[PDB]
Design a binder for this molecule. Structure first.
Ligand SMILES: [Ca+2]
Ligand SMILES: [Ca+2]
Ligand SMILES: [Ca+2]
Ligand SMILES: [Mg+2]
Lengths: 735, 146
């Protein structure tokens, strides 16, 4: 923000050479404070009265402590402070007089002072003893009770040891003082008057100039950001909504740092957090069964699907069970089902959560059974005492949506093979994305290759050569046997995360099984809150799909980290046919970028398949062929625009030579648009293209010479028969 | 196995440059059809493909002749997407353009010291329309075009 505002460069170098001398006499930091305080200074010409663009009613004369004395005679002022939200200093100058009896400029000082006062040390950080114990110098510390140069009608009260007891009742007054110690410590004339009369205010002001000013100007600066930031609960306040097991999260905290790369996780079910710290394995790609959120089984992947969230969905369960069955049918020996065994803690946990209610006991076939209660009205559950297994049955007076009725059976859950032993399954750590530092990717490339590349003689080839390298070793993502789809580093990262939550004590395998959701091109999901662990090791969690996007733009995108976003964004994800939006820079600049040959023909093809009617039919009509012949003409111009030999020219020419090529195209379009009958679906597209071209050519023009409006420049063209001289015209048209 | 949509295009463009309106295109025509689609086979590489099926006036290729020959250099490539992400990277600020500023920038983290001189240089030789910056389009050209 530029602080000074000189509004009418009316006088020669005098009004100027005066505002300057004025300002330069003020400390470069006092301004900094003013600036950070969102302040602005107005040095307008001759604008005395309630006349400046900012001098009409806002937060003016309400009460009267005004100048070095309270006087309050407005029409006579030449300096003023808009005092509330953002400070607004306004000064004006007429002819040469501020230096003889600077007893005047001293107001441009206090008038200024009334900015820092209630927002300086006096109160900004609170009167910290620094300013309090300085005010104690009323008359009891130093042998200098010489404070009339700042304290008359509000401090002839020497008969008060001024301390916390009363200093507040008169902040507006203990400011008028800070406004003189300032007006005096800097006034172009009287400065020692402050070092003589009061020995403290001086040293105070003086130590303020020694750096006290750079202080507040830095506690306001740092808070400059922390103040206006992106609302994202950090610390464990997030680690809670996260879902991750705090031990693991902390474990991750290392890698993020060592490797220097952000880590983002989608929500990890609460109902599965401890099932993890516990030792329960996590769901991979091998299982597409649904979890559950209620009853004993909650947090597990019940082989029985009517015991998972989709409780009732006669088809989500119908086709639901069909999934576990396959999960086991295909990936046998690795995936299967095992009896549910709610341990101790878990029980006491599903407790307050209200998932279950442990109550009355019972006896069957000789074994003890504490009965596990759940409000579900179709299944009854009981846990075993010898082994604490869990069982259920379709109540004596009810049925199962699929049409099943069974007596006390064991609750099987899904379990993958870990170290040769089926372990129950629960939610895994789904990475939303991984943002490694651009420089860490550099370390990915093999010294020699990247070497053999920079040596290249051709400059533009070097670039290409590099970009690929960066694509080759950092952006490319190949599929994979198990870990889904991910990049090589993405994999290495995957291990360092797992072996990291392994040395913590987890005994159930990995917790991050597949690649990053930014590759979930098939069935992309859109989670609101995303847990992130920056390279510094600070937990964070967003609240919006927007905030996330906004966060990633500020920190990951615009900050030297490699990040790419789900290829299905802004498109229509096939699988779940979902439309999930993500700001795409490229598409931003589309609005004013002339289409390409191929981008053009592409769009034609699309519409053809949409209205089963093409820009031109395969007929005998000779006006049809005209249309064909004519699009082929645009498909040319557009193709001509993007010519690689455009380098053997100069930026000047480039624009021109292209502003024409572009114009050419704009024509044939305007041409066809006025042809025979062309389906309106196309009529519109061509309409769209026009604006692009227009927009583009405008850009090329304002970039170089400003007045020429596209519409006008067009008019002045002769596209009848000869194009030749028309181009020579175009040139002259631009002068 | 080109997607149907990926098929509509090849025909929407193959037939746009089929002047005599039948369904077979001349050599020079095949070169044209392709370029428009954003591809440019060498003056000699353009034959080996058309020369791989001499069942015409030993000179043209039908709709299928073409539709099928778009695998040899097609069925295996999916780079158009990576390159677009490469671009997104350099475009540090999200304006949709790549300023020489940011070129040199990302250029260094990847460990390369570029001379303030040899950058405004690349940016220039990469800017086709002369607005001093490179957009996805020109970027695409610089990258792919060999
Ligand atoms: Ca033909
Ligand atoms: Ca940019
Ligand atoms: Ca450009
Ligand atoms: Mg998963």
């Amino acid at each position: 923000n530029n602080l000074v505002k000189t509004e009418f460069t009316n006088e020669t170098l005098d009004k100027i050479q005066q505002t300057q001398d004025l300002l330069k006499k003020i400390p470069k930091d006092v301004l900094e404070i003013y600036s950070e305080l969102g302040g602005e200074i107005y040095f307008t010409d001759i604008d005395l009265v309630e006349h400046k663009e900012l001098q009409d009613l806002s937060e003016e004369e309400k009460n009267s402590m005004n100048s070095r004395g309270e006087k309050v005679p407005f029409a006579s002022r030449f300096v003023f402070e808009k005092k509330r939200e953002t400070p607004k200093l306004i000064i004006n100058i007429k002819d040469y007089a501020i230096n003889s009896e600077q007893s005047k400029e001293v107001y441009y000082e206090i008038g200024k002072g009334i900015s820092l006062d209630i927002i300086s040390k006096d109160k900004s950080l609170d009167p910290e003893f620094l300013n309090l114990i300085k005010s104690l110098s009323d008359d009891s510390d130093s042998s200098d009770l010489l404070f009339s140069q700042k304290f008359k009608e509000k401090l002839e009260l020497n008969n008060k040891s001024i301390d916390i007891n009363f200093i507040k009742e008169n902040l507006t007054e203990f400011q008028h003082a800070f406004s003189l110690a300032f007006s005096y410590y800097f006034a172009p004339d009287h400065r020692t008057v402050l070092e003589l009369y009061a020995p403290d205010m001086f040293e105070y002001m003086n130590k303020l100039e020694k750096g006290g000013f750079e202080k507040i100007s830095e506690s306001l600066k740092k808070e400059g950001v922390e103040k206006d930031r992106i609302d994202v609960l950090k610390g464990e306040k997030a680690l809670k909504a996260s879902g991750l097991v705090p031990e693991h999260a902390d474990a991750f905290k290392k890698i993020a740092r060592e490797l220097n790369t952000y880590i983002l996780f989608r929500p990890v079910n609460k109902l599965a957090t401890n099932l993890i710290k516990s030792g329960v394995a996590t769901k991979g790609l091998n299982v597409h069964g649904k979890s559950s959120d209620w009853g004993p089984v909650a947090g597990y992947i019940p082989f029985d699907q009517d015991l998972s969230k989709k409780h009732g969905q006669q088809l989500a369960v119908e086709k639901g069970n069909l999934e576990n069955k396959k999960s086991i049918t295909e990936h046998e020996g690795e995936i299967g089902k095992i009896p549910l065994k709610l341990d101790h803690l878990r029980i006491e946990e599903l407790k307050e959560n209200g998932i279950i209610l442990k109550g009355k006991k019972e006896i069957d076939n000789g074994k003890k059974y504490y009965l596990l209660e759940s409000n579900n009205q179709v299944y009854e559950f009981r846990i075993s005492d010898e082994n604490n297994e869990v069982q259920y049955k379709t109540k004596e007076g009810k049925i199962t949506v699929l049409g099943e009725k069974f007596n006390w059976r064991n609750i099987e859950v899904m379990a993958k093979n870990v170290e040769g032993v089926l372990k129950p399954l629960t939610a895994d750590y789904d990475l939303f994305a991984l943002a490694p530092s651009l420089t860490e990717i550099k370390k990915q490339i093999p010294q020699k290759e990247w070497d053999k590349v920079v040596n290249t003689p051709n400059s533009l080839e070097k670039q290409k050569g590099v970009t690929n390298l960066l694509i080759k070793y950092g952006i490319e993502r190949k599929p994979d046997s198990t870990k889904g789809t991910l990049s090589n580093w993405q994999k290495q990262m995957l291990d360092r995360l797992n072996e990291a939550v392994k040395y913590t004590g987890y005994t159930g395998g990995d917790v991050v099984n597949h690649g990053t959701e930014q590759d979930n091109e098939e069935f992309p999901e859109k989670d609101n809150e995303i847990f992130i662990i920056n390279p510094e090791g600070e937990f964070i969690l967003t609240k919006n799909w927007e905030m996330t996007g906004r966060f990633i733009e500020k920190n990951i995108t615009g900050k030297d980290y490699l990040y790419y976003f789900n290829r299905s964004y802004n498109k229509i994800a096939p699988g779940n046919k979902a439309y999930i939006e993500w700001t795409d820079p490229i598409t931003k600049a589309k609005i004013n970028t002339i289409p390409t040959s191929a981008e053009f023909i592409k769009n034609l093809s699309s519409i053809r398949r949409s209205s089963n009617v093409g820009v031109y039919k395969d007929s005998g009509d000779k006006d049809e062929f005209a249309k064909k012949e004519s699009v082929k003409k645009i498909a040319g111009y557009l193709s001509d625009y993007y010519n690689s030999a455009n380098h053997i020219f100069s930026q000047e020419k480039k624009r021109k030579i292209s502003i024409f090529r572009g114009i050419q195209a704009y024509n044939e379009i305007e041409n066809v648009l006025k042809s025979k009958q062309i389906a309106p679906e196309y009529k519109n597209y061509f309409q769209y293209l026009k604006e692009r071209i227009t927009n583009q050519v405008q850009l090329l023009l304002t970039h170089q010479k400003s007045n020429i409006e596209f519409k006008l420049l067009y008019k002045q063209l002769n596209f009848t028969e000869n194009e030749t001289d028309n181009f020579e015209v175009f040139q002259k048209i631009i002068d | 196995q080109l997607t149907e949509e990926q098929i509509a295009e090849f025909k929407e463009a193959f037939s746009l440059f089929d002047k005599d309106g039948d369904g077979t295109i001349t050599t020079k025509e095949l070169g044209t059809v392709m370029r428009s689609l954003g591809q440019n086979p060498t003056e000699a590489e353009l034959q080996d493909m058309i020369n791989e099926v001499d069942a015409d006036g030993n000179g043209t290729i039908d709709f299928p002749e073409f539709l099928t020959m778009m695998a040899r250099k097609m069925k295996d490539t999916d780079s158009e997407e990576e390159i677009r992400e490469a671009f997104r990277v350099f475009d540090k600020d999200g304006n949709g353009y790549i300023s020489a500023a940011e070129l040199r920038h990302v250029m260094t983290n990847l460990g390369e010291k570029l001379t303030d001189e040899e950058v405004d240089q690349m940016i220039r030789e990469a800017d086709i329309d002369g607005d001093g910056q490179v957009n996805y389009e020109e970027f695409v050209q610089m990258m792919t075009a060999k």
